[PDB]
């Protein structure tokens, strides 16, 4: 399933990045590229299935400690 990430999922990810003081360019896109073993250069280029995995990881991080 290669449906692109939807706007709702993107907005939840953006929310957590801001709360974590992290960014797509410095933090998340590099990690997504390593985990998904593919060149991911923009937030819009994730699949919805990939974005859901990233979102779960961000939720873990935001839930863990202040």
């Amino acid at each position: 399933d290669i449906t692109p990430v939807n706007d709702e999922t993107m907005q939840e990810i953006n929310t957590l990045l801001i709360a974590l003081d992290k960014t797509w360019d410095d933090d998340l896109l590099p990690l997504c590229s390593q985990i998904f073993r593919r060149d991911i250069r923009a937030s819009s280029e994730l699949t919805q299935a990939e974005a859901v995995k990233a979102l779960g990881f961000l939720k873990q991080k935001a839930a863990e400690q202040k």
Binding site: K22, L31, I35, R37
Partner: peptide, 10 residues
């Protein structure tokens, strides 16, 4: 493979 279920720093 490292993946998003792992306890990796961020």
């Amino acid at each position: 493979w490292m993946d998003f279920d792992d306890d990796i720093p961020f």
